[PDB]
Design an enzyme around this catalytic site. Structure first.
Site, PDB file in Angstrom:
ATOM      1  N   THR B  10     -18.034 -39.098 -32.690  1.00 22.24           N
ATOM      2  CA  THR B  10     -19.053 -38.074 -32.958  1.00 22.24           C
ATOM      3  C   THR B  10     -19.549 -37.290 -31.725  1.00 22.24           C
ATOM      4  OG1 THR B  10     -20.678 -39.884 -32.906  1.00 22.24           O
ATOM      5  CG2 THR B  10     -19.926 -39.240 -35.018  1.00 22.24           C
ATOM      6  N   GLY B  11     -19.377 -37.820 -30.521  1.00 22.52           N
ATOM      7  CA  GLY B  11     -19.820 -37.118 -29.313  1.00 22.52           C
ATOM      8  C   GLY B  11     -19.051 -35.827 -29.004  1.00 22.52           C
ATOM      9  N   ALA B  12     -19.401 -35.174 -27.896  1.00 16.87           N
ATOM     10  CA  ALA B  12     -18.745 -33.940 -27.459  1.00 16.87           C
ATOM     11  C   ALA B  12     -17.276 -34.148 -27.072  1.00 16.87           C
ATOM     12  CB  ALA B  12     -19.520 -33.316 -26.277  1.00 16.87           C
ATOM     13  N   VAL B  13     -17.009 -35.205 -26.304  1.00 19.65           N
ATOM     14  CA  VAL B  13     -15.635 -35.571 -25.950  1.00 19.65           C
ATOM     15  C   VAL B  13     -14.880 -36.074 -27.186  1.00 19.65           C
ATOM     16  CG1 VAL B  13     -14.164 -37.218 -24.682  1.00 19.65           C
ATOM     17  CG2 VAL B  13     -16.096 -36.118 -23.531  1.00 19.65           C
ATOM     18  N   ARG B  38     -26.169 -45.601 -35.577  1.00 22.67           N
ATOM     19  CA  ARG B  38     -26.820 -44.436 -36.182  1.00 22.67           C
ATOM     20  C   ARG B  38     -25.848 -43.451 -36.835  1.00 22.67           C
ATOM     21  NH1 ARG B  38     -28.097 -45.202 -30.864  1.00 22.67           N
ATOM     22  NH2 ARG B  38     -26.629 -43.935 -29.633  1.00 22.67           N
ATOM     23  N   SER B  39     -24.586 -43.451 -36.411  1.00 25.61           N
ATOM     24  CA  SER B  39     -23.558 -42.664 -37.093  1.00 25.61           C
ATOM     25  C   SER B  39     -22.804 -43.440 -38.182  1.00 25.61           C
ATOM     26  CB  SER B  39     -22.560 -42.119 -36.074  1.00 25.61           C
ATOM     27  OG  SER B  39     -23.215 -41.196 -35.229  1.00 25.61           O
ATOM     28  N   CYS B 127     -13.740 -35.871 -14.863  1.00 18.50           N
ATOM     29  CA  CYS B 127     -13.275 -34.536 -15.259  1.00 18.50           C
ATOM     30  C   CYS B 127     -12.943 -33.646 -14.047  1.00 18.50           C
ATOM     31  CB  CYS B 127     -14.253 -33.797 -16.226  1.00 18.50           C
ATOM     32  SG  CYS B 127     -15.814 -34.573 -16.790  1.00 18.50           S
ATOM     33  N   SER B 157     -21.282 -29.743 -20.728  1.00 18.54           N
ATOM     34  CA  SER B 157     -20.734 -30.561 -21.835  1.00 18.54           C
ATOM     35  C   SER B 157     -20.338 -31.975 -21.385  1.00 18.54           C
ATOM     36  CB  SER B 157     -19.525 -29.897 -22.510  1.00 18.54           C
ATOM     37  OG  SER B 157     -18.451 -29.665 -21.598  1.00 18.54           O
ATOM     38  N   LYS B 222     -17.181 -40.436  -6.784  1.00 20.95           N
ATOM     39  CA  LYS B 222     -16.049 -40.629  -7.675  1.00 20.95           C
ATOM     40  C   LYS B 222     -14.931 -39.686  -7.282  1.00 20.95           C
ATOM     41  CE  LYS B 222     -18.907 -40.937 -11.617  1.00 20.95           C
ATOM     42  NZ  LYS B 222     -19.307 -41.501 -12.940  1.00 20.95           N
ATOM     43  N   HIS B 251     -15.092 -26.575 -16.022  1.00 17.58           N
ATOM     44  CA  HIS B 251     -15.427 -26.782 -14.618  1.00 17.58           C
ATOM     45  C   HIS B 251     -14.615 -25.850 -13.714  1.00 17.58           C
ATOM     46  CE1 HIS B 251     -17.257 -31.061 -14.988  1.00 17.58           C
ATOM     47  NE2 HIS B 251     -17.394 -30.405 -16.120  1.00 17.58           N
TER      48      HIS B 251
END
Ligand SMILES: Nc1ncnc2c1ncn2[C@@H]1O[C@H](COP(=O)(O)O)[C@@H](O)[C@H]1OP(=O)(O)O
Ligand SMILES: Nc1ncnc2c1ncn2[C@@H]1O[C@H](COP(=O)(O)O)[C@@H](O)[C@H]1OP(=O)(O)O
Lengths: 357, 357
Positions: B10-13, B38-39, B127, B157, B222, B251
């Site tokens: 359900t997330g953006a990724v 919750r999902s 990313c 995002s 990182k 990016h």
């Protein structure tokens, strides 16, 4: 007192020039606003008074002591030499006269002394250069500068009133009307004078100004050459990448330097804080660093994220932020005028060294 | 065919993981979507099919061949070892396993060979790191890499779905309601975990992730540590400044490198063009360079503004852009999975090398 003239009063920079002149200590007996022929007749405030805007011509500078120009490099090339012939001290905010050896290129905190030998024109440096010079001068003084590499995060107000409106309207078309950003139509950015134009909304455009022969843009090359002139050292290596981003006001800059000698970070923080016009905003434990939105409306240059390079002994990274229309232009220009007055340098020049067009 | 689970569907990724799986060559017999309590019980498409979302537990991975994790670090630390124990091969999007020596850290174009020795978990790198690796690996392969200095221009995002919504409404408040950027209430950015929160609308925030004890942030460190693991060379000097800007997706990076041997720029351009997953967009005469808005929806990594440093003989600058949720997350993850299938590496691991929490 002086008779002061703003040439390009109606523009983005000219409007900040009025605001800064209003807040100035400069003793002004008479204020005039100058512009192109279409603006002539309109009214515009100085404090509470109403001022009539006038056409800029070759004859419009009689009796003027100081003229601030921000009307694009074309209006300065044509009219500034006539102002000098009339006995004016011109402070120019455009790029035209910046690389003339007869014209001091000045940030008051760094090279005020260059003002003493002026021949009627004083150049205000490029906004991106000025804030960097404020942040870096105190370091140069104590430890030297071997090289600068800088990447900029520049606001759209630098591109003029039209750029601001373009940006705002692009953002509203995406957010309200649901237009894909790669489908937006643009007229100005990245550069009004160039052939093609791109959207800035939700984008980062790696062009400011047009391209030169060496594949750097004129902005990046101005950062290079203007640094060498302001700091009076042609041996300082400077390379820059200049990028526009969706910010209305305030340029940010990621700055990397190598000093001539190792510079303890806490001494660097202290040195930047002690320097006039620079403010240390560096306390990472409470997430304190310079931010573009907080810098809006202030004359200071805010510096933080100061830390040493992970590998280069003498290398230092930092983050520099300033209102691009204030210290980046209008405040620098008015500070130059205040400095000219401090030093008794507001008087006619005897030899004209700038050919009339 | 494979049973494939998406954790964090359900997330953006996770939404881009679904899209990349939908367009994958991978033979998929069964799809499952895992998320939190919750999902759980909600529904979500895979092509024309309705897929009921399930709560992630330790016993939820029976029968699964491949699990793509993008549900935050705590979720991968808690559940991915149980998935491995059950016989899954895990492609983890998060940072939690990136520096474990029993875990390949992979960008398929650069280091696919490291997949061969996997022990049930392959880490997808950060990313901003992935796109830098695609651009520089062809340079490294021919001329070497002594050092990297990078300044990022990162979309929101990558901070997740709440961050996207927060950006959108902040801009809507400024633009439609007249709210000053100073007066915006933020809840997530610059970093949901940290103590204080600042507006990203018309701003540039030089913090991504929380600060480490050396004054660099976890994001910046990182870039450093991942670059070294991926290129299998600890002697590559890397320093980063990571800044969030008002972009939703894509990016951009201003990249400086010094190589070990002189690299003629016309050869570097060519070598980048020939590298799988890198596209050369470099024609300044016609203002051609990578742009975030154009990169969105492409798996490719776009490289331009390529030019030699003005003083350093081995120095080179460039501009690198990619969709952060595609090549920077979900496509890299699916491309890892496709590569694993190619090499017959999708199979249970016998020896458990990861702690059960
Ligand atoms: N030929 C000119 N003579 C005097 N002022 C000019 C001339 N051309 C442009 N300007 C002024 O320079 C500024 C342009 O910058 P900006 O895009 O931010 O407005 C305006 O003040 C504009 O005045 P005007 O509004 O009459 O055209
Ligand atoms: N404890 C958890 N267990 C499994 N998935 C989680 C957990 N916490 C968050 N997630 C999932 O990680 C993803 C977060 O993505 P993003 O940061 O873009 O919002 C979501 O799909 C979220 O699911 P959920 O929708 O049920 O909250």
């Amino acid at each position: 007192g002086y008779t002061v003239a703003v040439v390009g009063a109606t523009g983005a920079v000219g409007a900040q020039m009025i605001k800064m002149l209003e807040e100035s200590t400069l003793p002004i007996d008479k204020i005039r606003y100058l512009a192109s022929a279409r603006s002539a007749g309109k009214s515009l405030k100085f404090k509470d008074q109403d001022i009539t805007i006038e056409e800029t011509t070759e004859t419009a500078f009689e009796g003027v002591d100081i003229a601030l120009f921000s009307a694009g490099s074309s209006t300065s090339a044509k009219y500034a030499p006539y102002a000098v012939k009339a006995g004016v001290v011109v402070v120019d905010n455009t790029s035209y006269f910046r690389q003339n050896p007869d014209v001091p290129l000045v940030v008051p905190e760094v090279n005020a002394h260059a003002l003493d030998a002026h021949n009627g024109i004083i150049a205000c440096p490029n906004c991106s250069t000025i804030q960097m010079m404020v942040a870096l001068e105190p370091v140069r003084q104590k430890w030297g500068l071997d090289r600068i590499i800088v990447s900029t995060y520049q606001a759209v107000s630098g591109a003029g009133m039209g750029a601001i409106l373009e940006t705002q309207r692009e953002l509203r078309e995406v957010l309200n009307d649901g237009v894909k950003p790669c489908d937006l139509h643009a007229e100005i950015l990245p550069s009004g004078g160039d052939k093609k134009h791109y959207p800035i909304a939700f984008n980062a455009l790696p062009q400011i100004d047009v391209f030169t022969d060496n594949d750097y843009t004129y902005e990046e090359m101005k950062m290079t050459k203007e640094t060498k002139k302001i700091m009076e050292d042609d041996s300082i290596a400077v390379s820059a990448t200049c990028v526009r981003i969706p910010v209305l006001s305030a340029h940010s800059e990621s700055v990397y330097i190598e000093t001539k000698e190792v510079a303890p970070i806490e001494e660097v923080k202290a040195a930047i804080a002690a320097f006039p016009g620079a403010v240390l905003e560096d306390d990472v434990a409470h997430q304190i660093y310079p931010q573009a939105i907080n810098a809006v409306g202030s004359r200071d240059t805010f510096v933080g994220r100061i830390r040493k390079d992970l590998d280069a002994e003498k290398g230092i990274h930092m983050w520099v932020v300033s209102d691009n229309l204030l210290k980046g232009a209008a405040w620098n220009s008015v500070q130059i005028a205040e400095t000219l007055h401090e030093r008794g340098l507001v008087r006619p020049t005897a030899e004209l060294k700038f050919e009339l067009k």
